[PDB]
Amino acid sequence: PVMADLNGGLQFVPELKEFTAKLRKELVETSEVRKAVSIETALEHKVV
Amino acid sequence: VVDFLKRNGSTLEQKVNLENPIPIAVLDSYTPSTNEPYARVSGDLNPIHVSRHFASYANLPGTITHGMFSSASVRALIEN
């Protein structure tokens, strides 16, 4: 019987769980803050 | 700077309404005979309340009282 590790090396990056859970927790921040800052400046531009 | 405080934040309103209004009194006062006694005290010699050749000049009902007298009387109507 053979095993065939077609894994890119993801057994080496250590503590991948939150290493993963951080990469996306940042992609929602950088996404949502540029959702909120963008709409209010566009809203700022509507009161001046 | 208020808009961004309107929808983002609240209004720290120091005025807090009571649950149910409670009436204190319903009273009556009397506008003076003439506006001369008040006009001499307040230093307000405004000829709209004493003279008649002026209230009629300003299309007014007549030699009206002083509004400030009306305020002070109602305030006195309250302190008691």
Side-chain angles (χ1 to χ4, degrees), chain A residues 1-21:
Chain A
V2 301
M3 302 204 322
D5 182 300
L6 315 184
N7 188 2
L10 282 181
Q11 63 283 29
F12 291 159
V13 46
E15 205 65 31
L16 173 59
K17 185 262 296 177
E18 65 260 36
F19 183 85
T20 284

mmCIF file of all heavy atoms in Angstrom, chain A residues 1-21:
data_model
loop_
_atom_site.group_PDB
_atom_site.id
_atom_site.type_symbol
_atom_site.label_atom_id
_atom_site.label_comp_id
_atom_site.label_asym_id
_atom_site.label_seq_id
_atom_site.Cartn_x
_atom_site.Cartn_y
_atom_site.Cartn_z
ATOM 1 N N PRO A 1 0.846 -1.189 0.000
ATOM 2 C CA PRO A 1 0.000 0.000 0.000
ATOM 3 C C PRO A 1 0.878 1.234 0.000
ATOM 4 O O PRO A 1 1.878 1.286 0.712
ATOM 5 C CB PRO A 1 -0.800 -0.128 1.293
ATOM 6 C CG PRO A 1 -0.251 -1.230 2.030
ATOM 7 C CD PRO A 1 0.721 -1.979 1.228
ATOM 8 N N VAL A 2 0.531 2.211 -0.831
ATOM 9 C CA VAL A 2 1.297 3.442 -0.930
ATOM 10 C C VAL A 2 0.478 4.583 -0.355
ATOM 11 O O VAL A 2 -0.745 4.591 -0.421
ATOM 12 C CB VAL A 2 1.698 3.772 -2.374
ATOM 13 C CG1 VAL A 2 2.524 2.662 -2.938
ATOM 14 C CG2 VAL A 2 0.489 3.995 -3.196
ATOM 15 N N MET A 3 1.167 5.540 0.239
ATOM 16 C CA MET A 3 0.581 6.840 0.498
ATOM 17 C C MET A 3 1.195 7.822 -0.480
ATOM 18 O O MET A 3 2.344 7.674 -0.890
ATOM 19 C CB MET A 3 0.791 7.266 1.944
ATOM 20 C CG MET A 3 0.233 6.292 2.927
ATOM 21 S SD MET A 3 -0.135 7.093 4.483
ATOM 22 C CE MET A 3 1.244 8.213 4.579
ATOM 23 N N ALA A 4 0.423 8.836 -0.858
ATOM 24 C CA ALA A 4 0.873 9.752 -1.895
ATOM 25 C C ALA A 4 0.570 11.169 -1.426
ATOM 26 O O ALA A 4 -0.472 11.720 -1.780
ATOM 27 C CB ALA A 4 0.194 9.457 -3.213
ATOM 28 N N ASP A 5 1.497 11.762 -0.685
ATOM 29 C CA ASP A 5 1.271 13.068 -0.077
ATOM 30 C C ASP A 5 1.291 14.131 -1.161
ATOM 31 O O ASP A 5 2.343 14.660 -1.510
ATOM 32 C CB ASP A 5 2.322 13.339 0.988
ATOM 33 C CG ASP A 5 2.117 14.663 1.698
ATOM 34 O OD1 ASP A 5 2.143 15.719 1.036
ATOM 35 O OD2 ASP A 5 1.942 14.650 2.936
ATOM 36 N N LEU A 6 0.119 14.469 -1.680
ATOM 37 C CA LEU A 6 -0.023 15.521 -2.671
ATOM 38 C C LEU A 6 -0.271 16.849 -1.981
ATOM 39 O O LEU A 6 -0.897 17.744 -2.538
ATOM 40 C CB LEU A 6 -1.157 15.213 -3.634
ATOM 41 C CG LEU A 6 -1.201 13.791 -4.157
ATOM 42 C CD1 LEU A 6 -2.312 13.675 -5.164
ATOM 43 C CD2 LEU A 6 0.120 13.409 -4.743
ATOM 44 N N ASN A 7 0.201 16.970 -0.756
ATOM 45 C CA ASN A 7 0.053 18.180 0.023
ATOM 46 C C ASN A 7 1.250 19.094 -0.212
ATOM 47 O O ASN A 7 2.408 18.674 -0.173
ATOM 48 C CB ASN A 7 -0.116 17.810 1.488
ATOM 49 C CG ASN A 7 -0.459 18.972 2.329
ATOM 50 O OD1 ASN A 7 -0.608 20.077 1.838
ATOM 51 N ND2 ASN A 7 -0.615 18.736 3.613
ATOM 52 N N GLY A 8 0.969 20.373 -0.448
ATOM 53 C CA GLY A 8 2.006 21.302 -0.852
ATOM 54 C C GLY A 8 3.051 21.570 0.202
ATOM 55 O O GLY A 8 4.012 22.291 -0.065
ATOM 56 N N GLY A 9 2.895 21.011 1.386
ATOM 57 C CA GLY A 9 3.833 21.289 2.447
ATOM 58 C C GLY A 9 3.082 21.869 3.615
ATOM 59 O O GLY A 9 3.663 22.355 4.585
ATOM 60 N N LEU A 10 1.769 21.791 3.535
ATOM 61 C CA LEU A 10 0.941 22.366 4.570
ATOM 62 C C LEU A 10 1.051 21.634 5.893
ATOM 63 O O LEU A 10 0.370 22.012 6.847
ATOM 64 C CB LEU A 10 -0.499 22.390 4.095
ATOM 65 C CG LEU A 10 -0.675 23.545 3.130
ATOM 66 C CD1 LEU A 10 -2.092 23.613 2.652
ATOM 67 C CD2 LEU A 10 -0.313 24.804 3.867
ATOM 68 N N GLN A 11 1.861 20.591 5.973
ATOM 69 C CA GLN A 11 2.164 19.998 7.265
ATOM 70 C C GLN A 11 3.353 20.668 7.932
ATOM 71 O O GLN A 11 3.663 20.352 9.085
ATOM 72 C CB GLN A 11 2.422 18.503 7.103
ATOM 73 C CG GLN A 11 3.620 18.175 6.236
ATOM 74 C CD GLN A 11 3.335 18.328 4.759
ATOM 75 O OE1 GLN A 11 2.499 19.133 4.358
ATOM 76 N NE2 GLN A 11 4.028 17.552 3.942
ATOM 77 N N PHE A 12 4.015 21.587 7.234
ATOM 78 C CA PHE A 12 5.181 22.290 7.745
ATOM 79 C C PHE A 12 4.865 23.653 8.321
ATOM 80 O O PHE A 12 5.393 23.997 9.376
ATOM 81 C CB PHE A 12 6.220 22.455 6.643
ATOM 82 C CG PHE A 12 6.854 21.178 6.239
ATOM 83 C CD1 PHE A 12 7.463 21.052 5.012
ATOM 84 C CD2 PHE A 12 6.832 20.094 7.089
ATOM 85 C CE1 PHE A 12 8.040 19.874 4.641
ATOM 86 C CE2 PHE A 12 7.408 18.912 6.724
ATOM 87 C CZ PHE A 12 8.014 18.800 5.497
ATOM 88 N N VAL A 13 4.044 24.447 7.650
ATOM 89 C CA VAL A 13 3.621 25.708 8.258
ATOM 90 C C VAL A 13 2.975 25.408 9.605
ATOM 91 O O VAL A 13 1.931 24.737 9.660
ATOM 92 C CB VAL A 13 2.677 26.465 7.328
ATOM 93 C CG1 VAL A 13 1.634 25.553 6.769
ATOM 94 C CG2 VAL A 13 2.018 27.598 8.069
ATOM 95 N N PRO A 14 3.573 25.827 10.702
ATOM 96 C CA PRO A 14 3.139 25.337 12.010
ATOM 97 C C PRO A 14 1.995 26.147 12.571
ATOM 98 O O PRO A 14 1.906 27.354 12.329
ATOM 99 C CB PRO A 14 4.399 25.492 12.860
ATOM 100 C CG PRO A 14 5.058 26.699 12.280
ATOM 101 C CD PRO A 14 4.714 26.747 10.811
ATOM 102 N N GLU A 15 1.125 25.496 13.334
ATOM 103 C CA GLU A 15 -0.046 26.148 13.898
ATOM 104 C C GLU A 15 -0.840 26.850 12.799
ATOM 105 O O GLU A 15 -1.131 28.044 12.866
ATOM 106 C CB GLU A 15 0.356 27.117 15.008
ATOM 107 C CG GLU A 15 -0.735 27.378 16.010
ATOM 108 C CD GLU A 15 -1.124 26.145 16.804
ATOM 109 O OE1 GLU A 15 -0.253 25.281 17.039
ATOM 110 O OE2 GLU A 15 -2.304 26.039 17.200
ATOM 111 N N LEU A 16 -1.179 26.080 11.767
ATOM 112 C CA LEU A 16 -1.884 26.588 10.603
ATOM 113 C C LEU A 16 -3.294 27.048 10.910
ATOM 114 O O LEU A 16 -3.803 27.914 10.195
ATOM 115 C CB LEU A 16 -1.931 25.509 9.526
ATOM 116 C CG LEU A 16 -2.757 25.767 8.271
ATOM 117 C CD1 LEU A 16 -2.266 26.992 7.554
ATOM 118 C CD2 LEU A 16 -2.717 24.562 7.361
ATOM 119 N N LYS A 17 -3.932 26.513 11.952
ATOM 120 C CA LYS A 17 -5.336 26.830 12.178
ATOM 121 C C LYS A 17 -5.550 28.326 12.270
ATOM 122 O O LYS A 17 -6.198 28.922 11.403
ATOM 123 C CB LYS A 17 -5.846 26.162 13.448
ATOM 124 C CG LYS A 17 -7.336 26.351 13.674
ATOM 125 C CD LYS A 17 -7.634 27.485 14.627
ATOM 126 C CE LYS A 17 -7.098 27.186 16.010
ATOM 127 N NZ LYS A 17 -7.313 28.317 16.955
ATOM 128 N N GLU A 18 -4.999 28.958 13.295
ATOM 129 C CA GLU A 18 -5.153 30.389 13.417
ATOM 130 C C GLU A 18 -4.255 31.151 12.475
ATOM 131 O O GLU A 18 -4.589 32.286 12.125
ATOM 132 C CB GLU A 18 -4.900 30.856 14.852
ATOM 133 C CG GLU A 18 -3.507 30.661 15.329
ATOM 134 C CD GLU A 18 -3.402 29.437 16.180
ATOM 135 O OE1 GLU A 18 -4.103 28.453 15.874
ATOM 136 O OE2 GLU A 18 -2.658 29.469 17.178
ATOM 137 N N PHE A 19 -3.148 30.567 12.032
ATOM 138 C CA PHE A 19 -2.445 31.163 10.909
ATOM 139 C C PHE A 19 -3.386 31.330 9.732
ATOM 140 O O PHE A 19 -3.339 32.335 9.017
ATOM 141 C CB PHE A 19 -1.255 30.314 10.509
ATOM 142 C CG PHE A 19 -0.460 30.917 9.418
ATOM 143 C CD1 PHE A 19 0.516 31.840 9.703
ATOM 144 C CD2 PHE A 19 -0.707 30.597 8.105
ATOM 145 C CE1 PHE A 19 1.244 32.415 8.701
ATOM 146 C CE2 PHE A 19 0.021 31.172 7.101
ATOM 147 C CZ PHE A 19 0.995 32.079 7.403
ATOM 148 N N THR A 20 -4.253 30.350 9.517
ATOM 149 C CA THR A 20 -5.330 30.525 8.561
ATOM 150 C C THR A 20 -6.369 31.501 9.080
ATOM 151 O O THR A 20 -6.711 32.463 8.388
ATOM 152 C CB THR A 20 -5.977 29.179 8.258
ATOM 153 O OG1 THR A 20 -5.126 28.421 7.393
ATOM 154 C CG2 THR A 20 -7.316 29.365 7.615
ATOM 155 N N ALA A 21 -6.852 31.292 10.302
ATOM 156 C CA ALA A 21 -7.926 32.096 10.859
ATOM 157 C C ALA A 21 -7.544 33.551 11.007
ATOM 158 O O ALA A 21 -8.426 34.403 11.141
ATOM 159 C CB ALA A 21 -8.360 31.538 12.213
#
